[PDB]
Amino acid sequence: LQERVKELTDKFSGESEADRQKFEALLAEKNEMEMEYEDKLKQAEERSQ
Amino acid sequence: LQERVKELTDKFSGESEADRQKFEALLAEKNEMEMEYEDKLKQAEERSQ
Secondary structure, three states: OHHHHHHHHHHHHHHHHHHHHHHHHHHHHHHHHHHHHHHHHHHHHHHHO | OHHHHHHHHHHHHHHHHHHHHHHHHHHHHHHHHHHHHHHHHHHHHHHHO
């Protein structure tokens, strides 16, 4: 009986941690491409002037 | 035996499920500002010409 507590706690928490890592990677991906666009706006403006 | 199993399974899996909606919202947020930045680049070049 007591083993059932350990089995469900570890794997589902890992599932929560695994889904958290994707969220962190997506946040890094979103932030990385955000500044990439910001570079594009200024480069076009500088060439325009 | 069953009481704990259903208790831990439901609450711990919900934490993993809760990280998916945040991931989906982050993905939707990431896609949305990408279109805005593309519009910004499109409008920045139009005035340049």
